[PDB]
Amino acid sequence: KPLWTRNPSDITQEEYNAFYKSISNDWEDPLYVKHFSVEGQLEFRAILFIPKRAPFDLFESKKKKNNIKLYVRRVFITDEAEDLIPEWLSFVKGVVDSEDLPLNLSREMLQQNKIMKVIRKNIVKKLIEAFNEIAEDSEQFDKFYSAFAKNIKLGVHEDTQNRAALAKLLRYNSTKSVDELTSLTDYVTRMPEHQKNIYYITGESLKAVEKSPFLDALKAKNFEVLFLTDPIDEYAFTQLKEFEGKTLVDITKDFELEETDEEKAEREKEIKEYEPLTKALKDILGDQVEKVVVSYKLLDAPAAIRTGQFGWSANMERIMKAQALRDSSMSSYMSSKKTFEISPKSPIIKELKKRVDEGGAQDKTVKDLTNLLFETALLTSGFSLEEPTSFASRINRLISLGLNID
């Protein structure tokens, strides 16, 4: 008698292990097992295995050796079932046995039918339930995440009816969770009552975002910010757009941070004094930025580059510009729009305001310093310079003036 025809409550763990060792060439114990059965008018018994790592051996690469095997009335069909399981979910193994599949004339091929799509949706929802059960065991969930984080993020990006269900499996670091990977539910439960947005920031690595200047202000309000380290998590974040009524806000892009009415008055009475400075920065930067705005999303940073909305992020622009087949003739310019954000509580910005109040808005030294500030803001924000020669010359001038070289 086959294993999938028995009750899972009467099957030992060693039997599942032997079944995995027979159907899979891996020697390690499968990280999780899921034997379930759907009854009613359509019946199928599926045993699914979650490996401890990515099954990327591929001794027969580019040839179809799909992991999920299909059985029709306890008869093996083939190993070319591709649409039975999504490609992003094509990392689990196991078998599924049914009796209502509309096979071909010779009963050796299954393609172009809708009776298999409902079984596929049942498989993916049962795999979601299995992942949720794995989430109860943190020790196994750490291995599952460190093995299939890219897969779960691609699944969040691809699927729609399971996007909100798969969003609960996302584990990231944050300013208050630098030691362990926190979840979105743990974030919204730790979120203050007045906060209404889930703030996140992307970067090339954790070391780049651990000291990013876009956090300080959000740390002044004690707002927790999620950290994104892979180039694939943005694909899922731009598809989620919200979680449990709390929308996702990327602080590297242009956004609004609500403040009190007294704070609004204190900021509107202070921006009106920096209008000539902002106009000078705008007409000296040209078309490099859309606007130079006095921003209060910084505390000690003199200036920063905030990519205007409708565009990408810093890490997103970095991962998109390094694609050879994406654009080779400079046809994409959506992410070219940026904003020059300045913090009025910085001594450099106050000195620039005093200088433009004196009337030296068109001074060569002020123009050079503003251009160098724009370049270092592009640098600290995560954008490559259009020409490092000007930045190098300005750095050399600063060093020469520091070493008393005239």
Partner 1 sequence: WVDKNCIGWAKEYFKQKLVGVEAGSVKDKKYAKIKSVSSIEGDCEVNQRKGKVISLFDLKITVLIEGHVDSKDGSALPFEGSINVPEVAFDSEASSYQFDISIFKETSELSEAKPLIRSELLPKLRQIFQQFGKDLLATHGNDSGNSTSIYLEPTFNVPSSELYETFLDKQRILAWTRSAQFFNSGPKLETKEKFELFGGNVISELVSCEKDKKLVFHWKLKDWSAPFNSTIEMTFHESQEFHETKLQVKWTGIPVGEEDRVRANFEEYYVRSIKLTFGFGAVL
Q: Which residues are documented as binding site?
A: 107
Asked if 401 is part of the footprint of its own copies (rule: CB under 8 A), the reply reads yes
* Partner whose footprint covers residue 81, from partner 1, its own copies, none (CB < 5 to 8 Å by kind): none
Contact predicate 294/302, CB 8 Å:
no
Q: How far is the CB of 351 from its own copies (least distance, A)?
A: 4
Q: How far is the CB of 244 from partner 1 (least distance, A)?
A: 11
Contacts with partner 1, 26-65, as mask; x by CB under 8 A: xx----------x-xxxx---------xxxxxxx-x----
Strands (E) across 73-189 are located at 93-98, 171-174, 182-183
Contacts with partner 1, 326-365, as mask; x by CB under 8 A: xx-x-xx-xx------------------------------
The residues that bridge with 197 in the sheet, in sequence order, are 247
CA distance 290 to 297: 18
Asked if 129 is part of the footprint of partner 1 (rule: CB under 8 A), the reply reads no
Of the residues 241, 269, 272, 364, which one makes contact with partner 1 according to CB under 8 A = 241
* Partner whose footprint covers residue 391, from its own copies, partner 1, none (CB < 5 to 8 Å by kind): its own copies
Q: How far is the CB of 59 from partner 1 (least distance, A)?
A: 5
Size of the site for partner 1 (CB under 8 A): 59
Of the residues 30, 51, 155, 213, which one makes contact with its own copies according to CB under 8 A = 213
CA distance 197 to 215: 14
Annotated binding site for ATP: 107
Contact predicate 303/378, CB 8 Å:
no
* Partner whose footprint covers residue 402, from partner 1, its own copies, none (CB < 5 to 8 Å by kind): its own copies
Nearer to its own copies, 245 or 402 (CB): 402
Contact predicate 314/383, CB 8 Å:
yes
Asked if 105 is part of the footprint of its own copies (rule: CB under 8 A), the reply reads no
Contact predicate 211/178, CB 8 Å:
no
CA distance 223 to 175: 9
Residues between 165 and 204 with contacts to its own copies, criterion CB under 8 A:
204
Q: Which of 104, 78, 80 is nearest to 90 (CA)?
A: 80
Contact predicate 130/50, CB 8 Å:
yes
Helix, strand, coil % in the chain, rounded to nearest 5: 40, 15, 45
Q: What's at 284, amino acid-wise?
A: I
- DSSP states along 299-358: SS-SEEEEEPTTS--HHHHHHHHT-TTT-SSS---GGG-EEEEE-TTSHHHHHHHHHHHH
Contacts with partner 1, 188-227, as mask; x by CB under 8 A: ----------------------------------------
Residues that bind partner 1 (CB under 8 A): 24-27, 38, 40-43, 53-59, 61, 100, 114-115, 117-118, 121-122, 154, 157-158, 160-165, 232, 234-235, 238-239, 241, 245, 247, 253-254, 256, 309-312, 316, 320, 323, 325-327, 329, 331-332, 334-335
